[PDB]
DNA sequence: TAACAGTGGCCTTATTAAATGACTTCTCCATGATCTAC
RNA sequence: UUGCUCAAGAGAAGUCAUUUAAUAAGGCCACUGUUAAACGUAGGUGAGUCGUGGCUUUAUGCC
């Protein structure tokens, strides 16, 4: 059959100065535009989300084609001809080799970018130099953003060249390295806090955003109206739903929810539980 | 003619203004053997305003650069059709008015 | 009975780069022009819509001419004589030799941004160090729902029973093309208005429309709403679906307004349920 | 024609007088020969409007200053309506109307 | 009251620029030898 | 009444059937807004409802 795991994670609230854009004058500005309601929010692309997984996948051993070095900053490839079967990084990500075993790939892996919950105001940081001589590159100024990040991502298992490769997946997913940015001055962990994940057998998803805001200053997260309306109005079925994180607890405090067919979906408010259930089921299904 | 045109003419003459009273409060603020700026706080002048985003933060940066130019003649004959002209448009075309006028006002100095 | 089935279908809304159109220099540009109000809306062209039923058809058993490979991400005919009367794909979507050219049972028209598409350039760029002509590069999404109009002769079709695949595959349509790596765009359906009729006559083509610029909240309309209260479009053969469902409901005198007696479900499985049921029993199935 | 921009324009032009009756204020605080400043006064109010940061401030602060502007007769027949506006509306959007009245006031003197 | 308003490096790498077949169909002639009717 | 007088280039015809601009990509790495200060001494206000109820001597005040 053709299994997808699709999914929703929302990160934990803080500073972020993630992805940035192009260099502009003295003032490094966040990648952001316009999202609901004609505000305007700040984005983490997806290549550098699939660049810490990346990173995830080449540090916890496996094998990966391209090995980020860490200390040139250079990326070296072991082998000059891809090989989805033997490297993790070309099976899950794919490759395309232009210049001039198929030459390209289509990833077993699909991202979109991270949105910011919160709408984005202000919040520009000055940065100095210091010392008391003073030159060009004395006076800067880096934007940042109080906010959690949320984004989107599909699965097709079916696709992996090897169908086991699916749990690192989900592990790095879970433990997610650094998300390219200034962690020296605005370090951001990118670990879910809530997750929203389906692990059905056909295309339709319907969980792409699940997550909105309250109050919307504020830290506060709460699953979106039209989500829950698409839950109990018989589409998603519950069965194929794991929702783990802090959003449990708003989720078990809503009344009704005993009566609700929210109530039966697979709902743990520890991660790690909910990553375990969904990996047995996964491995039941894919016969690992 | 037209009285577009004529308003989008002075709200240049305006921000020239402005322009030249912020470059002279620059050459006031520098001192000693240093050279003032010319031409790059005509280019620090640009990046502050492609840094700018949705309706609120172009208006506030333009309305502070023109309190900043101090004095200036072009808004005080026309207070009402400036007011409108800046409070009313979309934003990014005053931003193109507003860097047509910084590639124009050198004449000046 | 000549019967046909028009329907308009509106996505979720997300970030969408799908049909890039040129690549002008470093840009990837996404495929637009003018649209409605003078502004310029994105498209997604038909044509990959059709590749998405197609690869939809193909995944799930379903006979099929056309083979996409998936690993050499080529084309393979199984017979080199397209034969409409065992091949899903040809009885469908038509062919042409360059014979018989078929005539295609399906028509699709491109998908349209409900909203007008502002800037929303991506940069993108290579690692660090040793820079080439290719580390940097930017990319233009959009964050909008996109809306088609399709329509479909069942008579025409040499089986009866093959459009029940098709619509199952229009509300779980799979990747359609564009960059899923980056931008995954699920294009299932959140909201449709499907018409179930017996003459060559629809007003209900991209009846969905919000404008409000930057927004998703998708109202259905207003000259539709107008279509259905003057007297034509019977609500008999009207199916209304998805999320807009809420929305019409919550409409003052709704009750009293003829729009209320058609056949209105909250949920899309039901109503495609009924509505697969409506066709079996029209076409003899 | 569509009021929204008639409390604008009056707004601008209250904040006119009251900006106008501060000055008359500080023009008093001062003495002897020493030249009382006009452009400082300017630069001085955009500095403090440019203090506050959101809701409580800056909401106080310039009801304060109107408050200060004195017997402003425009602001007598436009008590209830500016009242109104300045509870309604973003604290930023009156910002920007405050520093434009500033940039467009002095043909008043 | 002051001094700065970014220091770098890149600005696409491929690939294909159409595949068929049709390229009007009819008619309206001018003029003298001969037939024939008055 | 004009090398003229009279004089329809007229009737009919689908540019059609088919086609993913697709596959891959971290705007990245570094930065204190450092150092010092006596508050000395004199600047004001925008807005309803209608005939005794628990204490207390009517009183007259409390809730």
Request: hydrophobic share 35%; proline share 4%.
């Amino acid at each position: 059959p053709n299994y997808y795991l699709y999914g929703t994670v929302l990160t934990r609230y803080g500073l972020a100065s993630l992805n940035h854009d192009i260099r502009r004058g003295n003032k490094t500005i966040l990648q952001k535009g316009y999202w609901n309601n004609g505000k305007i929010h700040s984005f983490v692309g997806s290549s550098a989300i699939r660049w810490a997984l990346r990173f995830y996948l080449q540090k916890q051993g496996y094998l990966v084609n391209r090995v980020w070095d860490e200390e040139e900053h250079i990326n070296r490839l072991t082998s000059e001809d891809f090989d989805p079967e033997k490297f993790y990084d070309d099976d899950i990500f794919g490759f395309a080799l232009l210049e001039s075993t198929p030459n390209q790939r289509m990833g077993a892996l699909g991202m979109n970018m991270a949105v910011s919950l919160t709408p984005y105001d202000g919040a520009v940081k000055l940065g100095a130099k210091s010392g008391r001589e003073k030159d060009s590159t004395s006076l800067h100024f880096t934007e940042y953003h109080a906010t959690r990040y949320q984004y989107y991502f599909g699965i097709d298992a079916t696709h992996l060249k090897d169908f086991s490769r699916i749990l690192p997946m989900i592990d790095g997913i879970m433990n997610l390295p650094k998300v390219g940015g200034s962690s020296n001055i605005f370090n951001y962990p990118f670990c879910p806090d809530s997750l929203v994940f389906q692990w059905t057998n056909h295309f339709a998803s319907y969980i792409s955003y699940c997550f909105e805001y309250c109050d919307p200053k504020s830290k506060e997260a709460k699953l979106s109206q039209e989500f829950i309306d698409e839950v109990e109005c018989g589409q998603i079925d519950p069965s194929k739903l794991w929702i783990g994180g802090t959003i449990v607890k708003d989720l078990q405090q809503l009344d009704n929810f005993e009566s609700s067919p929210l109530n039966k979906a697979h709902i743990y408010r520890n991660r790690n539980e909910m990553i375990e259930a969904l990996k047995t089921v996964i491995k039941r299904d894919l016969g690992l | 003619n037209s009285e577009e045109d004529k308003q989008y003419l002075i709200f240049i003459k305006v921000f020239q203004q402005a322009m030249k009273g912020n470059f002279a409060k620059i050459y006031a603020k520098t001192e000693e053997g240093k050279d003032p700026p010319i031409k790059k706080k005509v280019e620090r002048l640009r990046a502050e305003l492609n840094y700018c985003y949705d309706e609120l933060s172009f208006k506030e940066y333009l309305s502070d650069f023109l309190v900043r130019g101090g004095l200036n003649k072009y808004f005080n004959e026309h207070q009402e059709e400036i007011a409108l002209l800046i409070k009313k448009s979309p934003w990014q075309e005053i931003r193109i008015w507003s860097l047509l006028a910084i590639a124009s006002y050198k004449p000046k100095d």
